[PDB]
Predict the structure.
Amino acid sequence: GRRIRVQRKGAGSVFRAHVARRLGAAKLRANDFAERTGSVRGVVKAILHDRGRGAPLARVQFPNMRGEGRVNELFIAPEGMYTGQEVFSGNKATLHIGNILPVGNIPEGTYVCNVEEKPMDRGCLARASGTYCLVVAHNMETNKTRIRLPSGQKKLISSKARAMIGLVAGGGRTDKPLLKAGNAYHKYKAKRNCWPVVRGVAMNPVDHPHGGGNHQHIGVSSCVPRNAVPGQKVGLIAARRTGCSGG
Amino acid sequence: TANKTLSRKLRLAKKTKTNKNIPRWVIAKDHLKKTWNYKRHHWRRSHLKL
Amino acid sequence: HAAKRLGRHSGHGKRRGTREARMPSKTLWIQRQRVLRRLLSRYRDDEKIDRHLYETLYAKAKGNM
Amino acid sequence: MAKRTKKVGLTGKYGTRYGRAARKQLLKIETSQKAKYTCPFCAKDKVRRTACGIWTCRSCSKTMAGGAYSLHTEPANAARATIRRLRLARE
Amino acid sequence: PNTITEENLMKMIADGRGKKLVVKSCSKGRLQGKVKLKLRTAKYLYTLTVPNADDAKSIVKGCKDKVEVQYV
Amino acid sequence: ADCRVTCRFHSTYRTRSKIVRYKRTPGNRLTSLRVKKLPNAPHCAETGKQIHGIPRVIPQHLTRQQRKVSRPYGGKLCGSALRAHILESFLNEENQALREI
RNA sequence: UCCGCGCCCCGGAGGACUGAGGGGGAGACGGGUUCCGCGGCGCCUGCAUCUGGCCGCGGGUGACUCGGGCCUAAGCGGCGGGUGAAGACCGGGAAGGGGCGCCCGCCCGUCGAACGGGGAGCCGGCGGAGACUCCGGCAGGCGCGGCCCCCGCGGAGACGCCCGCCCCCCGGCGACGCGCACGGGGACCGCGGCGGGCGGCGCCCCGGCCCGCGAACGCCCCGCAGCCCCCGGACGCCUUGCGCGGAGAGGGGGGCCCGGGGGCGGACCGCGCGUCCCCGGCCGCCCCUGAAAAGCCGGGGGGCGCCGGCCGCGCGCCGUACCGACCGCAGCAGGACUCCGGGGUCAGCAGCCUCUAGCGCGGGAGCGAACGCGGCUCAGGGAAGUCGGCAAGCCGGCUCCGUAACCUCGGGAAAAGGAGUGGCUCUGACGGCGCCGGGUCAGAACUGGAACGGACGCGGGGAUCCCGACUGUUUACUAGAAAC
RNA sequence: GAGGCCCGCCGCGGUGCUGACGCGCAGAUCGCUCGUCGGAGCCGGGCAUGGGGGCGAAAGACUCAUCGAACCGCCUGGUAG
């Protein structure tokens, strides 16, 4: 047989992210003494576009607490933030869109984004266009806060973890049809070599497990076990159920 | 090529300097009889640096 | 080219290009619009025509009146 | 006038291609993307899209984050209200 | 090259600053109103066009014996 | 009858820095003079408007008086921006006193 | 082709061709002396040779301003260490920089681009071979010294004015997409006129042709649009399209930038339509947002003394000939990256002819069989031929009529189908007025073997049925498909 | 003045003639006729990916005239009823 496309992808080499001309790593401002007690004030210098990200980014300039200059942070932009806004990242921060406060401080029912999976992780959950997490409940004895991830799954994260108030901007980007293959090529060129996609039933027996016969058929069931081998997991992995259904 | 390097030019200039026939007096001194250098190269039929 | 000026060699048989290609119907518009906007502007500056009329006439000129 | 009788108003470019469903959807998104929106500061209908999510008011000279195809998205309008109600309630 | 300020600056440069040579190029192509004086300095060659030969003479008067004249 | 010309640059590839302007020389020949890309004048750091008073020449070949505007924060901030900065600073100090009083 | 030593060499005369995406002039790369002059034909020049890219002999590449070098890009290497039997491979967490008293300081690229970024070159000449390099002029850049001088003013403002440096901070320039239009310059082009030089002339000809040059740079003045300032307080101001204005329009006066134009210095006169290149203000576009740094320069705060001017000198290293000569066994209908691009006809950079420039390809003579290849025409019929209209042919430019079913309402559609088209002599339009400058759109007479897109270029059309929605992609060297 | 729109030059492909050639001009060229010609476009330089591996709009295609497993040397004068 031949190594399949999935196997060839993990060595990078042509399938590595097209990261040239990307602004930088969008991350929440680092936790600092002035964040832990009180709030640091930043000004949104610019709202720009990341090459591979649908959501707009934002250059917010905070003062340098450590020294004498000014430090620039790159943040995923909540909708409604504007150039020349004053954004406060702190334990004592007001509940306005853009501000970063610890999740215990954030009240229940609040739309939050760029939430930290664990305190001082500088950003993890709810970072894509339109996506948000909501505060569900706070256990003040366990210092833990339940949040609902955009998937629906409920995660108990430390009350110390920080989040930016608001819903990420770029909302409703996938509503528009791509319409042409060309529009897809332009989107993927800013991302990685994953497009165009050839179906395995199109490929010859060597190239893919679905492979090929006199007629294009999946042969055995597409469902594969979770404990498949690395070149064998190709169809629906560990499917609990398959098929279109109600709900 | 017009934008060559001195180190490529100097190894090429050795070949131009040594693409010479045996001096006639050398044939007479050594009774060589064979008067062809045989290490001589003609640009069109040759591929130096290959 | 002296005959052409008189109008000797410019008939339908001697034309090999579309009327828009021979003379662009866009460059004929720019000229007319400029010529008429120059006339109306001078009249407004001279006080011959009112500011309000100038606007009404300016729109009708833009509307191929 | 009314050069295109049906809703092929901005989708005349696509011609006889892509199917009716795609063209109908594109009518709504395209008309929204090239529309002028009212800047919450200039209060003038001069906001136009620069990129997906980035909108600039030509007079106010202020760039604001927004929905990919509209200056303001319905989910966002609701969130701002929920955050305001919760904020006012906390104080 | 430049045009020297009247014979105001021309004679000031002639007195002290580099004046390696002056050329009284009268009759440039045998033309009238044509006395062009070309001061060579270190920085630039300067030319003052003077209306009359007599006008040129007043500037030639006071030309240093050290300053060298050439005539075309 | 031929005014065709040959490249002045080291290689024929015509890039942004490889553009020529044709003039006729004293000896009746078309010559290719190089066209240097215009450097651009300083733009206000706040806002983005070109700073008035500074020519679009590389700053090194400019002269100190030419490369400066006689104003506080002159080649950095445009006047409207500077007056906003002055006003914002003064007003903040005046509101702080009112908070204390 | 003719004559001249007469060779396919060279010179003159003809007759032509490549035809400005060139058989033209130049570079990148690859070759590496092929370059130049002189001689020569033994090799080679698939015929010849007196020729030559061949052979012998002697020569030939000159840079402060051009490129390398330098910067960073994708990348690649380095790193206390980390692994592996090793060879090697992997890598930030590791007391990682300097003088004197101090001070400041987490941590690598003197890697990587003769197209990206960069401090600065123009003219004229000269040689057998070269030139942005030589030489003659004229300039610009960056530094090193001598000498002298000396630490801000003006404005209502936007600005203006010859001006300091170091540190730390903040910023700018370097620095950026694509497009249809529209504007402005430059070059080119064409038209007159005048001035100079020709050629033809059977008749005409002030009707033909050739030439008429002005660089970088340095001062001064202008420069649309744009962006600002000051008064003031509104339906207006405006574009080709737009756009704009109580967050200040219009109007009035100003400031700035403008790869540009003029004037002088360096050193023939007018006009027009285009073409090409640059540039501008827009407007459109994107689930696409169109590099970075070296370097240079402002600004804030601290320190702290510069600053200039003038006059000398300096600028090291390497590349620099030539290419129909590269790579395919070859002096091979094959490939091979650019740059600059005249005239006529034309919508055209198409086709067809031409100026400039180049130049007659492993040879020539006869003869005019079959047959073959590349074409041409064919009476009457008009696919009866054939697996099948394969091949050929019809059709076609433009203008004005007219145009169906169906349809996802965008299409179909150039549906289908008609009619005209030349040349002359005019007549209106249209901006242009001191009337001057356009070449298109109409309309008209008169013509002519019953012609006119007269060459050239340049859909045959319709009725269905099956697939695959589409534009795309594919088996280099037998399958372009319904496959992907 | 919009379009992975149409006609059409170069370009880039390569349909048909199953034309020429087939001891070639050529180990795939030639002539017409063509597909496309603002785009999932075309083209140069640098760079990345390596052999049971790569890369593949998928043809078992392509990887230096070599691909249903490149090439070079060796094991190897492999073994053969």
Residues 1, 3-23, 26-35, 37, 41, 51-52, 54-55, 58, 62 of chain C lie near RNA strand G (CB under 10 Å from a C1'). Chain C is about 65% helix and 0% strand.
